[PDB]
Write an enzyme that holds these catalytic residues in place. Structure first.
Site, PDB file in Angstrom:
ATOM      1  CD  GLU A  35       4.887 -21.312 -29.660  1.00  0.00           C
ATOM      2  OE1 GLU A  35       4.096 -22.140 -30.180  1.00  0.00           O
ATOM      3  OE2 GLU A  35       5.804 -21.661 -28.885  1.00  0.00           O
ATOM      4  CG  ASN A  46      -0.271 -30.281 -28.440  1.00  0.00           C
ATOM      5  OD1 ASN A  46      -0.899 -29.580 -27.635  1.00  0.00           O
ATOM      6  ND2 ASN A  46       0.581 -29.777 -29.312  1.00  0.00           N
ATOM      7  CG  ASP A  48      -1.139 -34.234 -24.795  1.00  0.00           C
ATOM      8  OD1 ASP A  48      -1.745 -33.577 -25.664  1.00  0.00           O
ATOM      9  OD2 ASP A  48      -0.543 -33.677 -23.854  1.00  0.00           O
ATOM     10  CB  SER A  50      -3.755 -30.986 -25.106  1.00  0.00           C
ATOM     11  OG  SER A  50      -2.411 -31.080 -25.546  1.00  0.00           O
ATOM     12  CG  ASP A  52      -0.441 -26.096 -28.376  1.00  0.00           C
ATOM     13  OD1 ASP A  52      -0.778 -26.451 -27.238  1.00  0.00           O
ATOM     14  OD2 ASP A  52       0.635 -26.442 -28.906  1.00  0.00           O
ATOM     15  CG  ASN A  59      -1.479 -27.764 -24.099  1.00  0.00           C
ATOM     16  OD1 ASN A  59      -1.819 -28.397 -23.108  1.00  0.00           O
ATOM     17  ND2 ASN A  59      -1.392 -28.307 -25.296  1.00  0.00           N
TER      18      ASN A  59
END
Ligand SMILES: [Cl-]
Ligand SMILES: [Cl-]
Ligand code: NA
Length: 129
Positions: A35, A46, A48, A50, A52, A59
């Site tokens: 990750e 991301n 959309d 958002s 991380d 998220n």
């Protein structure tokens, strides 16, 4: 902070992640490697809108507040910036809520695609724990 492999394993074990909801320590170390490459300061945006955050790439649409993800929730009740600390406590405590929500570690795409069904114990081999 960029953790070493065994240093992160020891920190995660002290914070109670070994066998948490049945996931052995190697699963958590494997997830963190793919990750974030063990970097507490990692961030990724991301599609959309958002973002991380941190060693486990938690998220902002569901788990933390970053002030720029409209309509999102803050289920861990923390600013997302707290997930970037060299102290992994906030990330671990939030990860415990995520893994308990029904879907286990499938919430982490890199775990599903690169750790699940592999010899994850290799990620803690050689470490003094
Ligand atoms: Cl393991
Ligand atoms: Cl599970
Ligand atoms: Na949020």
């Amino acid at each position: 902070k960029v953790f070493g492999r065994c240093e992160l394993a020891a920190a995660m074990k002290r914070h109670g992640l070994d066998n948490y909801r049945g996931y052995s320590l190697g699963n958590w170390v494997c997830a963190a490697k793919f990750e974030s490459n063990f970097n507490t300061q990692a961030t990724n945006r991301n599609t959309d809108g958002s973002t991380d955050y941190g060693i486990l790439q938690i998220n902002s649409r569901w788990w933390c507040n970053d002030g720029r993800t409209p309509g999102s929730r803050n289920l861990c009740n923390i600013p997302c910036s707290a997930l970037l600390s060299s102290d992994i406590t906030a990330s671990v405590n939030c990860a415990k809520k995520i893994v308990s929500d029904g879907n286990g570690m499938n919430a982490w795409v890199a775990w599903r695609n690169r750790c699940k069904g592999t010899d994850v114990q290799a990620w803690i081999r050689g470490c003094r724990l």
